[PDB]
Design a protein around this ligand. Structure first.
Ligand SMILES: [Cl-]
Ligand SMILES: [Cl-]
Ligand SMILES: [Cl-]
Ligand SMILES: [Cl-]
Ligand SMILES: [Cl-]
Length: 194
């Protein structure tokens, strides 16, 4: 019952307040799909023209152009921001480590093991468990993710002058979460903000 109270508090926090929970995210080399190149000390992920040299790995995505953060979060509260390149097809979210890495089930937001917001075909959508909800359009090119492991929720914010709520999900999480990302189409790039 007190989860609602904590959620309401976090929905009203300023960017400065959310940054008290800042975590440094870096992209995990062993998860990147071979169409995804990592650069800038593992803080930029881009769609590569040709295939990357990666060897197969049980954690590596082989169906969807995705990559995860290296660290997972099991307890406490965590906040990070991602800068998107204008007009790119891309997605920003969280997933359980037990999310599939092969097949259509590995796609972020299309299974019960992940939650995301996604820019695609000129729309912005929130996804979980293969259910999509179209969100109001915004010109924001930065997204903030507030993950609360203790009271069970994730909030997606559009970051411009201030933070603006995009969507939130309440969940009693059953295992640790990793930051999760999708990039698609030549030129698409996204970066973890400092
Ligand atoms: Cl894909
Ligand atoms: Cl943790
Ligand atoms: Cl688009
Ligand atoms: Cl809390
Ligand atoms: Cl703000």
């Amino acid at each position: 019952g007190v989860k609602a109270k904590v959620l309401e508090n976090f929905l009203t926090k300023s960017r400065t307040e959310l940054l008290e929970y800042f975590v440094k995210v870096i992209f995990d080399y062993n998860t990147a799909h071979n169409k995804v190149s990592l650069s800038n000390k593992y803080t930029t992920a881009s769609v590569s023209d040709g295939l990357q040299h990666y060897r197969s790995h049980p954690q590596r995505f082989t169906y969807c152009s995705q990559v995860l953060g290296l660290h997972c979060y099991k307890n406490g509260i965590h906040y990070w921001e991602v800068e998107l390149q204008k007009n790119n097809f891309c997605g920003v979210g969280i997933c359980y480590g037990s999310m599939e890495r092969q097949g259509p089930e590995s796609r972020l937001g299309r299974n019960p093991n992940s939650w995301c917001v996604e820019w695609f075909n000129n729309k912005i959508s929130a996804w979980h468990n293969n259910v999509e909800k179209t969100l109001p359009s915004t010109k924001a090119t930065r997204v903030g993710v507030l993950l609360n492991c203790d009271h069970g929720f994730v909030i997606f914010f559009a970051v411009t002058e201030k933070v603006h709520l995009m969507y939130k999900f309440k969940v009693d999480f059953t295992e640790a979460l990793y930051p999760a990302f999708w990039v698609f189409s030549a030129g698409t790039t996204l970066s973890i903000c400092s």
